[PDB]
Structure formats: structure tokens, C-alpha cells
Homo-oligomer: A and B are copies of this chain.
Amino acid sequence: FPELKNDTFLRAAWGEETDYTPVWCMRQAGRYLPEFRETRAAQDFFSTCRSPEACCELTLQPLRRFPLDAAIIFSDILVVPQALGMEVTMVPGKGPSFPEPLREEQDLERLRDPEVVASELGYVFQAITLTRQRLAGRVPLIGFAGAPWTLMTYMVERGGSSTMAQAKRWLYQRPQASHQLLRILTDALVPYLVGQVVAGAQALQLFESHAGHLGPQLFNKFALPYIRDVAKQVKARLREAGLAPVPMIIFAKDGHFALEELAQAGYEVVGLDWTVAPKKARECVGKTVTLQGNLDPCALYASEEEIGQLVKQMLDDFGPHRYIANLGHGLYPDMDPEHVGAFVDAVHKHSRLLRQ
């Protein structure tokens, strides 16, 4: 692969001092871009996913508009449960879902052996290699996957609820089966993530998007062990394969209660939602880990001038060290591209000021 030109994101991720604060946006490749919708309709969501060229194209689209300091491969977190053998339907406007969710312990018998999952996800590896070659070292490429608990919520609920009452019912009524499902997911994720890195990912983000539905007690029993296990095993396999381990980011949305624990889970970066004040996040995590986040994405509905001020304050709160700017969640589809550009420009402009 070509030599990386801008590595600011990787240096920040490892904790090193940098000349400015690197920035990227969750869902930078998303429906808020007209060119994204255009390209999506050229297949059918997952036929888009399954085309390496299509996934590479959607990944690069934002980088043609904005000087983002990383790219993230376009895919979806549900590719994993699909590769385990759950059927998915694209609901037009209403999103990828499982029409037959896991309902009881017996339903685990329909899942593939997790050890075969990586062979099922070869299309994603191909997209990663292609995107790494086409980026030509401009900025690093981040790979990703959903975290075990969160993937579990999608498998058991049908998809997204507002309570995860059904998922949480599993935890309380079927703890043994829950742990079984979570181990299967873990054992599938590890080879998928190692594979992304073999294919050419230069960092990895684990999305624990549905963390907030758990309180501390359930989270420490059912989410945290698997989060730790994913990091430990990925690092080990990479070492053993002769490869350099990559910075890993854990993002637990609505996970204020777990930040202390997450900072000692084997991840270089803890990503934050917008409900946590940066100074309190820094208190909770300590000074080794890097923080990523955390602007309210709805802040981009404000004026460009207002976005600049909100960014200035966010940066003052985080300070220059151990920090990667991002939003506190993914961009929404009605957002204005030029407001995304303002965000990016503002991070770069004010972070330089803050330094000298």
C-alpha cells in the first residue's frame, strides 16, 4: 500500500502531540450527501455493500468535499449477524431489519459457526483493500463493527426499539443463552476485525450504540467482558500474524456510567456522546486514553458562525492533548453539507490557535 501522507489521526489516537486536532464525522458517508443517495439507488442497500467499488466510492465521497483527517469504510454493523445466517430485508425508508429475530434459546441453532463468518465477509475486505489503494495514503482508513451487546439487540428485537425491553428480558430471564449468543458474536467479530486490518484498515472502531439501555450492573456482566475480549484477542492475532496492531476505539453511546471501566478495556480511544461534558469525561477516563467526540450533531442545524463558536468551546473544554474531534453521534440525513464543512474547518482553525 502507499505510504500514509497525513497521519495526524493515528498520532492523536496513540496519544502523541500534533500540530492540530484531527477530525472526522460518524456517518460522513451518509444520506445528507446527495451524491450518496444517487449511488445507493444504483443497487439495493446490501448489493451496494456487496460491491467493493460501490463501497469504496461512498467512502471517498466525503473526502472530496471536506479535508477530513480519516476515512471510515462504508458498510453496516448488521453485516455480522447476516453473515451468521440471519436474513435481512431493506425496508424502503425504514431501514435494514430482521423479519425473523431470535426469539428463544433454540433459535441459536440457526447461526453459523463464528469461525466461518470471516469467509462470508470477503466483500468487505475487498472494499477495504480497494479503498486503501484508491485513497493513496491521503489519510488513514478506519475499519469497524458493532459491539456484541449491540449486535445482540438487533438480533433479538428485530432491529431498533426504544427500551430494548426484549433484549434486556433475555439478560434477566435467559442469562446463560445470552452469554452464549454474546460469545458467538465475540468469536465472529475477532476474525472479522483482524481481517479488516489484514485487508488494510489502519484503525478500528467498535460501536456499542445501545449501551445506554443497560445500567452499570448489567453492562459490567453482559457488555464489558466481551468488549475487553474483542480488543485483547484482536491485538493477539495481529501480533501473531506478524502485523502491526492498530489504534482501537470503543464508542459506547449513552455510556456515561461506564467510562471509567471503558478507559481500562484495552482501547487507545474512548469515543463520547454529546451528553457528557468533556471536562467530566477527562476526569472519568484519566490521562492515558485518547478521547474522541463529541459535538451534538444537531448543532450543525445552527448557523456556520454558531457552529464555529460551539466548536471553539468544545475544543477549549477538551484541551489540545489526547483528543480527536468528532460528533457525539452520526450525521442525520437532513443535514447541510456546507455545515459539515464548517465543522471540519472550525476544528482545524481553532485547534491551531489553541496551540500557539
Please name the residue on chain B nearest to A169 by beta carbon. B301
Contact B163 A332 (CB under 8 A): yes
Could you tell me if B298 and A172 are in contact, using CB atoms closer than 8 angstroms?
yes
Residue of B nearest to A164 (CB): B298
In the complex with contacts A254-B254, A302-B173, A275-B165 CB distance below 8 A: no
Contact B160 A162 (CB under 8 A): yes
Q: Evaluate contact between B296 and A218: CB separation under 8 angstroms.
A: yes
Which chain B residue shows the least CB distance to A334? B165
Say yes or no: is A312 at the interface (Cβ < 8 Å to chain B). Answer: no
Asked if B328 and A215 make an inter-chain contact with CB atoms under 8 angstroms apart, the answer reads: yes
- A257 to B302: give the CA distance in the assembly, Å: 22
Is A349 part of the contact surface with B, judged by Cβ < 8 Å? no
- Look across to chain B and name the residue whose beta carbon is closest to the beta carbon of A280: B257
**Stoichiometry (number of copies):** 2
Residue A212 contacts which of B165, B172, B217, B254 (CB distance < 8 angstroms)?
B254
- How many A residues face the partner with a CB closer than 8 A? 33
Q: How far is the CA of A277 from the CA of B258 in the complex (A)?
A: 10
Asked whether any CB of chain B lies closer than 8 Å to the CB of A256, the reply is: yes
A217–B214 Cα distance when bound, in Å, is 25
Interface residues of A in 160-184 (CB under 8 A from B): 160, 162-163, 165, 168-169, 171-173
Partner of A215, one of B215, B217, B274: B274
Q: What 0/1 pattern do residues 291 to 322 of A give for CB contact below 8 A with B?
A: 00000101101100010001000000000000
Write the chain B residue with the least CB distance to A328: B215
Residues of B within 8 A of A216 (CB): 275, 277
For A168, the chain B residues whose CB sits under 8 A away are 296, 298, 301
Cβ of B257 and Cβ of A172 under 8 Å apart?
no
Indicate with 1 or 0, residue by residue over A27-66, a CB within 8 angstroms of chain B CB atoms. Answer: 0000000000000000000000000000000000000000
A254–B214 CA distance with the chains assembled, in angstroms? 12
Question: With A215-B296, A216-B277 given, is the CB distance from A165 to B257 under 8 Å?
Answer: no
A276 within 8 A of B: yes
On whether the beta carbons of A277 and B298 are closer than 8 Å, the reply is no
What are 27 A-B residue pairs whose CB atoms fall within 8 Å in the complex?
A: A162-B162, A163-B298, A163-B332, A165-B298, A165-B332, A168-B298, A168-B301, A171-B298, A172-B298, A172-B301, A172-B302, A172-B306, A173-B301, A173-B302, A212-B212, A212-B254, A215-B274, A215-B276, A215-B296, A215-B328, A216-B275, A216-B277, A254-B254, A256-B256, A256-B257, A256-B275, A257-B277
- A: which residues have CB within 8 A of B? 160, 162-163, 165, 168-169, 171-173, 212, 214-218, 254, 256-257, 274-277, 280, 296, 298-299, 301-302, 306, 310, 328, 332, 334
- Top 7 A-B pairs ranked by shortest CB distance? A168-B298, A172-B301, A172-B302, A215-B274, A169-B301, A215-B275, A256-B256
Instruction: A215-B275, A215-B296, A256-B275 are known; give 16 further A-B pairs, CB within 8 A.
Output: A160-B162, A163-B332, A165-B298, A168-B298, A168-B301, A169-B298, A172-B298, A172-B302, A173-B301, A173-B302, A212-B212, A212-B275, A215-B274, A215-B276, A257-B277, A257-B280
